Design a protein around this ligand. Structure first.
Ligand code: HEM
Ligand SMILES: [C-]#N
Length: 343
């Protein structure tokens, strides 16, 4: 059914299988040290595998991303205990900058590093805390990431598909099916992740750190390139300043290819702007136009089935939220409503 997922999951598995600093047995020791708030021990453990002689010259993207993952868990940990990692680990910042250069990603761990690039076995999976809730959080992202990447590709493909073609309805239907995985992620998070443990125990590990004279955010699910998908789908031409700033904030943390997708579509009319213009010119008497628009409305429905329950999850956590979530929700409803009004 979701036949496009495989190639994305295989690209993640390559990084997850890589251990170029031979760090697996070492990183497993980190949760114990975190529980004990043993800052000197955390540094000492990192120095057991941190390269001091620059990066091995035969490394490609896979090795450098895997290295960033394994050092990365130490970065959020050190900052969790109140320390700038670059300040307490001499020689660390150059290695972080070298790995940023090798991966074209920021100089710390991102969501990708800690979820899909992180091996799944109990004797391999890297973790800040070792807690069941952190493991369930990783699983919730693994449920939908590959499917989301397939969805980005489908959205880009749909963008060049005429609403007059029966291919428009078919592509949209297929798109909707991939985006249902985001819904499955939030349902999973609801079932398995305690907001008490999240806010008190996990959230402290996601503070920003300073590298290269700026601040880089911690590896949250917010970094999922869903904002790129919707930039193409409906948001590229938005003049809403809060929204624009949101997208620009997280842009540095997504894969290079999705930063390029983002740039390609910026300014330019979004998919639904073009679709609705096409519908207004040709008319909804055209069977394919009607079917296309109907299928497109279902795409917005599934986005809303992710977004509204995600907002309640976040509020339940903050109870024991950032206004941006409410505003994005509002924008999504208005986009869907534009699609409905065309019908
Ligand atoms: C208890 C768990 C969670 C909490 C408390 C939470 C909270 C938040 C918060 C506060 C934001 C706004 C940015 C920020 O301040 O970090 C955000 C954004 C976002 N989060 Fe979560 N989140 C949780 C789980 C998840 C999961 C499981 C996913 C998907 C697998 C997810 C996906 C997203 C996305 C895509 C955004 C961007 C906003 C949007 O697209 O609507 N989050 N979340
Ligand atoms: C959601 N980070």
């Amino acid at each position: 059914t979701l036949d496009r997922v495989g190639v994305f999951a295989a690209t993640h598995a390559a990084v997850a299988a890589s251990d170029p600093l031979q760090a697996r047995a070492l990183v497993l020791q980190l949760p114990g040290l975190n529980r004990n708030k043993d800052v000197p021990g955390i540094v000492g453990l990192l120095r057991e595998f941190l390269p001091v002689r620059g990066l091995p010259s035969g490394w490609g993207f896979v090795e450098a991303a895997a290295a960033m993952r394994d050092i990365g868990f130490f970065l959020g940990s050190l900052k969790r205990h109140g320390h700038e990692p670059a300040e307490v680990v001499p020689g660390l910042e150059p290695v972080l900058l070298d790995l940023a250069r090798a991966t074209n990603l920021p100089p710390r761990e991102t969501l990708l590093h800690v979820t899909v690039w992180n091996p799944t076995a109990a004797d391999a999976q890297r973790s800040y805390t070792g807690l069941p809730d952190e493991a369930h959080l990783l699983e919730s992202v693994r449920i939908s990431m590959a499917a989301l990447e397939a969805a980005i590709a489908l959205t880009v493909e749909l963008f060049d598909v005429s609403l007059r073609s029966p291919e428009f309805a078919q592509r949209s239907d297929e798109l909707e099916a991939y985006l249902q995985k985001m819904v499955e992620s939030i349902v999973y998070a609801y079932r398995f992740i305690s907001p008490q443990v999240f806010y008190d125990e996990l959230r402290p590990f996601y503070e920003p750190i300073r590298v290269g004279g700026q601040s880089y955010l911690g590896p949250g699910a917010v970094e999922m390139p869903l904002f790129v998908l919707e930039h193409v789908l409906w948001g590229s031409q938005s003049d809403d300043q809060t929204y624009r700033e949101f997208k620009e904030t997280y842009l540095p943390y997504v894969l290079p290819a999705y930063r390029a997708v983002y740039a390609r579509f910026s300014g330019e009319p979004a998919l639904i702007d073009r679709a609705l213009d096409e519908a207004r010119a040709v008319g909804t008497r055209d069977e394919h136009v009607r079917a296309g628009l109907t299928a497109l409305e279902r795409v917005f429905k599934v986005l809303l089935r992710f977004r509204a329950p995600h907002l309640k999850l976040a509020e339940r956590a903050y109870e024991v939220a950032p206004s941006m979530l409410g505003e994005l929700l509002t924008l999504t409803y208005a986009a869907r409503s534009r699609v409905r009004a065309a019908l």
